[PDB]
Amino acid sequence: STGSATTTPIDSLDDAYITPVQIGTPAQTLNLDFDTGSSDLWVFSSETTASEVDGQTIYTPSKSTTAKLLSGATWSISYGDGSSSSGDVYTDTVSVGGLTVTGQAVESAKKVSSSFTEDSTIDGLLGLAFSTLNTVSPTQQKTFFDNAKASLDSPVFTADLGYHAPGTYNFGFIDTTAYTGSITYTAVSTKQGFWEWTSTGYAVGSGTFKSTSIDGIADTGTTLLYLPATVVSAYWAQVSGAKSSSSVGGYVFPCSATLPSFTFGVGSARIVIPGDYIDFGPISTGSSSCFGGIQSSAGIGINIFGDVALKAAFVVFNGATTPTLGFASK
Ligand SMILES: CC[C@@H](N)c1ccccc1O
Ligand SMILES: CC[C@@H](N)c1ccccc1O
């Protein structure tokens, strides 16, 4: 089997991407944030505290003839940005782009943090990291991809995120028309539960490539590119007037600037992020200070190849017995 679903930016800044997901019988379609940095499929629901729901579409398990309460199961998750959610668990039929999993754990939120409430465009998350990170207790549950894997034509999914445009998540096949050149594959460590890999270096604009190992994670659920402070400083030094602002929370730059590209290495291959992809717009409405798309990871503990980096590539998440990642230009 295969599946293919269009993923759409939630706003004009590509803050995140939403993909429609069918849950239950009859189907209830929710728009979920596919997140290769986590491993829970959780949704706003009829059980979510009413004051914490503000415009999201909810899953109502009582209206699904295939929903079953997973007795005794609870979940609770905290994300790298400080947001969180928790609740109980159903199993139900879940379909993405024509690919159907029966008995998928659907984690129903009883509580969500304010950032989730305040964002009406995201109805939940669909985790695509390794199932070892799943938070369901006392019996950990498998991701959608883990449940589908054995049925897929090939045990892979691909992320093809758009810049200011729609894009595609495919399951079970590699669309050879969706990229240019070849796909370069690189080793993955699953020891932390992430799609963790080592970039071979970087360049700023037309500058020389610096060969240096940068360990990080491929994370579709993170908006920006988080890299070591040395790398980030070298990038922003090429933008007149750019500076790190402690009050804003990162590097800002004059909105009148033209940003240089940023290149990262994948083996001997190179993925070029155009300068425009690094512009996150005024820090507040009407400001002439703009927030940068490349930021320091120093306060995270890991480097994160988020959407800024991934949307410059066609990315293969190869879930073979020994997982690997693939990157192609497009
Ligand atoms: C918007 C870019 C375009 N290549 C595309 C993206 C997603 C789905 C269909 C399409 O025609
Ligand atoms: C000024 C941009 C700011 N709202 C932002 C900061 C980090 C990640 C995404 C974002 O859009």
Swiss-Prot record:
Catalytic activity annotation: Hydrolysis of proteins with specificity similar to that of pepsin A, prefers hydrophobic residues at P1 and P1', but does not cleave 14-Ala-|-Leu-15 in the B chain of insulin or Z-Glu-Tyr. Clots milk
Primary enzyme class: hydrolase
Entry annotation: catalytic residues: 35, 199
Domain Peptidase A1 intervals: 17-328
Keywords: Aspartyl protease, Disulfide bond, Hydrolase, Protease, Signal, Zymogen
Keyword Signal: yes
Enzyme Commission (EC) number: 3.4.23.22
Disulfide partners: 255-290
Molecular function GO labels: aspartic-type endopeptidase activity
One GO-annotated biological process of the protein: proteolysis
Superkingdom of the source species: Eukaryota
Family: Belongs to the peptidase A1 family.
Protein name: Endothiapepsin
The organism of origin for this protein: Cryphonectria parasitica
